[PDB]
Amino acid sequence: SGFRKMAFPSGKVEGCMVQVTCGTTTLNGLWLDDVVYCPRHVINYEDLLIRKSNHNFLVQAGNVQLRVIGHSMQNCVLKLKVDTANPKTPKYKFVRIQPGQTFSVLACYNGSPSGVYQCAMRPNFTIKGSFLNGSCGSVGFNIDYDCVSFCYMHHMELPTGVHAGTDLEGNFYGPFVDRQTAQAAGTDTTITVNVLAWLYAAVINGDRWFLNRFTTTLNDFNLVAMKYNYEPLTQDHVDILGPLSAQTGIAVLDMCASLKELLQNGMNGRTILGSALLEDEFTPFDVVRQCSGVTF
Amino acid sequence: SGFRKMAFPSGKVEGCMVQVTCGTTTLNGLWLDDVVYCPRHVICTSEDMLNPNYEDLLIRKSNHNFLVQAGNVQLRVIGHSMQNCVLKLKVDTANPKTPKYKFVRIQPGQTFSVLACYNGSPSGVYQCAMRPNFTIKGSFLNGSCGSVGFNIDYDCVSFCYMHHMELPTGVHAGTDLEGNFYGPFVDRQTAQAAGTDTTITVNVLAWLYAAVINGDRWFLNRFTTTLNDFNLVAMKYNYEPLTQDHVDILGPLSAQTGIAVLDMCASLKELLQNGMNGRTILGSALLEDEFTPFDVVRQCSGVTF
Numbered sequence: 001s002g003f004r005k006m007a008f009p010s011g012k013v014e015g016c017m018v019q020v021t022c023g024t025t026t027l028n029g030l031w032l033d034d035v036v037y038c039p040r041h042v043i044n045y046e047d048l049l050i051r052k053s054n055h056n057f058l059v060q061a062g063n064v065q066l067r068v069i070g071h072s073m074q075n076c077v078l079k080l081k082v083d084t085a086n087p088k089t090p091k092y093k094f095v096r097i098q099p100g101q102t103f104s105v106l107a108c109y110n111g112s113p114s115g116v117y118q119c120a121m122r123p124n125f126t127i128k129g130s131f132l133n134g135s136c137g138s139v140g141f142n143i144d145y146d147c148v149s150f151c152y153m154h155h156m157e158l159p160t161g162v163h164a165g166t167d168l169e170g171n172f173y174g175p176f177v178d179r180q181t182a183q184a185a186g187t188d189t190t191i192t193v194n195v196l197a198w199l200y201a202a203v204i205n206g207d208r209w210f211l212n213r214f215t216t217t218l219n220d221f222n223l224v225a226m227k228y229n230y231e232p233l234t235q236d237h238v239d240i241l242g243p244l245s246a247q248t249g250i251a252v253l254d255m256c257a258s259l260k261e262l263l264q265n266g267m268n269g270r271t272i273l274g275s276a277l278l279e280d281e282f283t284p285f286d287v288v289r290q291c292s293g294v295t296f
Numbered sequence: 297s298g299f300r301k302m303a304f305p306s307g308k309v310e311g312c313m314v315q316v317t318c319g320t321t322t323l324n325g326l327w328l329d330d331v332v333y334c335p336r337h338v339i340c341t342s343e344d345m346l347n348p349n350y351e352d353l354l355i356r357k358s359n360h361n362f363l364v365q366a367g368n369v370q371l372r373v374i375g376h377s378m379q380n381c382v383l384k385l386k387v388d389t390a391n392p393k394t395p396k397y398k399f400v401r402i403q404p405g406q407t408f409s410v411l412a413c414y415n416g417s418p419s420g421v422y423q424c425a426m427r428p429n430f431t432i433k434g435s436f437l438n439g440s441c442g443s444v445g446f447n448i449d450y451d452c453v454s455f456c457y458m459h460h461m462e463l464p465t466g467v468h469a470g471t472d473l474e475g476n477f478y479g480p481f482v483d484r485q486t487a488q489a490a491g492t493d494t495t496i497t498v499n500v501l502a503w504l505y506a507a508v509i510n511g512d513r514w515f516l517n518r519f520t521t522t523l524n525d526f527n528l529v530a531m532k533y534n535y536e537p538l539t540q541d542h543v544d545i546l547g548p549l550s551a552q553t554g555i556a557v558l559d560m561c562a563s564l565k566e567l568l569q570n571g572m573n574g575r576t577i578l579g580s581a582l583l584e585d586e587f588t589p590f591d592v593v594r595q596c597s598g599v600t601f
């Protein structure tokens with residue numbers, strides 16, 4: 001029993017965190033094999049990069065200084081070739097996630113990991129993270145089997161306190177650029193398939209007060225959900241929730257009618273899994289994993 | 297900016313998790329130097345759990361009855377002893393991944409990270425608090441016994457909790473790493489129930505100071521309170537009494553934000569009376585009590601927005 005916002009064990013990622021200094025700027029880098037990946041804003045980026053030499057980049061792994069022997073840029077990520085392969089390099093992949101998907105963030109300062117938390121890529125491509133100055137270069141990841149899938153690298157904070165960054169190939173999530181200009185997150189929406197998954201997790205943990213005898217149609221549900229700034233629910237989402245529907249005995253459009261009643265009438269002083277708000281940062285896969293005990 | 301429930305990086309603890317098997321029971325152990333620590337109920341059958349005599353069950357065991365597995369390697373058990381509710385298995389190999397560590401016993405209201413494991417394999421990490429009724433609201437399934445709670449301030453891992461059991465309400469009970477239970481619990485399948493739980497007042501106040509640091513002040517009022525009047529009101533909402541120690545501990549946050557502890561107590565009093573009126577505080581519609589004053593100072597900036 002119990003339902004917590006759970007992050008993946010961070011050890012495989014901790015053994016990759018390094019400190020990258022260029023002039024006055026210090027941020028975090030990801031050391032995989034003989035390459036250190038970090039935000040290019042550590043340095044017209046091609047014009048600024050051409051003026052740099054290998055010895056201008058100081059890379060520190062624990063108490064050891066790594067020697068930079070080459071450098072290149074890929075989109076908004078700087079790739080620093082180092083003379084030493086990381087002996088702690090785990091099995092890994094660079095993957096680009098979609099909005100609604102969740103991941104763990106290992107927040108670092110000066111190449112030293114300080115905390116791990118779980119979060120979701122919002123529909124407006126920002127993340128509601130917890131980052132201070134020096135956090136740049138902190139990474140997002142998932143673990144599937146013994147393989148670390150790196151999906152996010154932190155680049156900046158927006159004026160609303162939310163965060164923006166790139167995949168590990170340097171492509172930003174969202175219409176953001178890595179510069180000091182007028183940038184604002186778009187109007188955000190609630191991740192409907194995730195709220196439904198979280199409602200199924202509450203039923204599994206013995207919370208059924210919100211269940212009712214009613215069912216709905218996908219069309220009627222989407223007409224109602226569009227009124228509350230909820231993301232549209234697709235047939236793919238309905239298919240993905242299939243296993244949880246079979247385990248609890250509540251059809252996806254049956255649970256949608258519960259969500260419709262919760263949206264139109266509120267919680268009436270009640271909570272669901274210790275929350276007075278509808279939680280949208282657990283995917284259907286996160287719910288099945290936390291209510292099954294998958295290990296790494 | 298931002299405020300998340302943050303856990304410590306778990307790598308230093310992952311390199312200590314092992315699987316302990318005794319007969320049909322399999323659970324987690326903590327391998328530090330040449331000793332594996334695990335719940336003593338690993339020696340029990342389900343029948344034995346009603347009235348187990350651990351001393352009688354342990355005397356019938358030999359070293360080779362305990363199977364310890366670290367990754368794909370079998371460790372050889374060369375000795376065994378019981379200390380309170382923890383079994384200490386002496387092994388022939390010191391853990392090369394043993395971090396700098398300490399065993400610390402925490403008090404209610406204190407927070408810690410939990411590395412939830414099954415079959416000696418870590419599956420997840422989350423942050424939680426020791427409730428005033430000595431239980432923890434964790435997320436654990438069967439096979440999670442032996443998972444540990446810890447804090448990592450600087451380079452030293454402070455082990456404070458080892459998971460032993462789930463109570464009827466879904467909450468969890470366990471021991472410090474010396475085998476002493478937190479709360480009036482026994483490692484026995486007996487009519488045991490968690491006491492009525494209360495809200496950790498000093499933690500809610502710390503979290504209200506964190507909201508002010510992140511630029512939110514809608515909940516403040518022009519009022520103050522005496523400590524006695526605050527406690528008379530707080531007790532009616534099942535909030536823990538606020539002591540002078542708690543007021544002293546909140547001193548730094550009071551100096552940083554410019555809001556006296558007893559003035560923050562007055563906003564808390566008003567929030568309990570009015571609710572949030574459709575508003576949130578740090579993305580929450582409930583008053584959060586699982587961040588200590590120390591957690592707030594660690595996570596938040598030193599400059600108030």
Ligand SMILES: CS(=O)(=O)Oc1ccc2cncc(NC(=O)Cc3cccc(Cl)c3)c2c1
Nearest residue numbers: 041131132133135155156157178179180297
């Ligand atoms: C603004 S500050 O308080 O001085 O420092 C912070 C604070 C929290 C912060 C949290 N995450 C990231 C930060 N850094 C930036 O956004 C730097 C920046 C600027 C322009 C363009 C880019 Cl790509 C990056 C943060 C800075």
Ligand SMILES: CS(=O)(=O)Oc1ccc2cncc(NC(=O)Cc3cccc(Cl)c3)c2c1
Nearest residue numbers: 001337345436437438460461462483484485
């Ligand atoms: C056997 S079950 O209740 O269906 O599965 C669970 C579920 C969640 C669980 C979460 N933590 C621990 C579990 N196991 C026990 O409590 C074992 C036990 C029993 C009596 C006394 C003691 Cl000291 C220990 C859990 C079992």
Ligand SMILES: [Cl-]
Nearest residue numbers: 401402403406
């Ligand atoms: Cl303590």
